[PDB]
């Protein structure tokens, strides 16, 4: 919804995200999938520099991604690591929602 929340929901400081612990918290409520971007915050904020009105943007560079995808057991996930571009909603020069991997 905003840049503080986007960092908490979609940026990770570790590539090997502990999906079963983090996606069990209220922020994620055992949802089926959540993609995290392995980077310190500023290079991710920079994707949106200059973009004021809300607009979805496909990154121009590929980033390390860590995806938590639910298994057949609720709230237990398999982590998949990949490198790809992704689409975010940029608003007032910061990412505020994660749209999807690979395309807008």
* Residue 4 β-bridge partners: none
Q: What is the CATH number of the domain that holds 93?
A: 3.10.130.10
Only one residue has tokens 């909603």, namely 89
Cα 43 to Cα 23, 26, 64, 95, distances in angstroms? 24, 27, 12, 11
The DSSP H or E segment spanning 5 is: helix 3-10
- Residue 55 annotated as lining a ligand binding site: no
Q: How far apart are CA 96 and CA 54, in angstroms?
A: 9
- Report the SS3 class of residue 91: strand
Would you tell me how many other CB atoms lie within 10 Å of the CB of residue 35? 21
> Which structural technique was applied?
X-ray
In degrees and rounded to multiples of 5, residue 16 shows phi and psi of: -90, 75
* Residue 94 β-bridge partners: 91
Q: How far apart are CA 60 and CA 78, in angstroms?
A: 28
> Is 97 part of the annotated catalytic residue set?
yes
Query: Please, what is the Cα angle at 20 between 37 and 9, to 5 degrees?
Result: 35
Pairing of strands 86-91, 94-101: antiparallel
User: Which residue range is the domain that position 65 belongs to?
Assistant: 2-104
Show the tokens assigned to 53.
């009105």
Q: What is the resolution of this structure in A?
A: 1.5
Spell out the SS3 assignment of 35-54.
EEEECCHHHHHHHHCCCCCC
> Is 10 part of the annotated catalytic residue set?
yes
Pairing of strands 55-58, 33-38: unpaired
Query: How many residues does this entry show for the chain?
Result: 104
In degrees and rounded to multiples of 5, residue 20 shows phi and psi of: -70, -30
* Count of domains for the chain: 1
Q: How far apart are CA 34 and CA 26, in angstroms?
A: 13
Q: Contact, 94 vs 43, CB < 8 A?
A: no
Please tell me which residue in 9, 76, 85, 97 is annotated as part of the active site. Answer: 97
Q: Running DSSP on this structure, what letter comes out for residue 22? A: H
């Amino acid at each position: 919804q905003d840049w503080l929340t986007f960092q908490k929901k979609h940026i990770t400081n570790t590539r090997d995200v502990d999906c079963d612990n983090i996606l069990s918290t209220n922020l994620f409520h055992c949802k089926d999938k959540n993609t995290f971007i392995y980077s310190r915050p500023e290079p991710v904020k920079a994707i949106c520099k200059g973009i004021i009105a809300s607009k979805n943007v496909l990154t121009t560079s590929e980033f390390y991604l860590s995806d938590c995808n639910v298994t057949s057991r609720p709230c237990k996930y398999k982590l998949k690591k990949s490198t790809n571009k992704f689409c975010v909603t940029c608003e007032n020069q910061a990412p505020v929602h994660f749209v999807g991997v690979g395309s807008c």
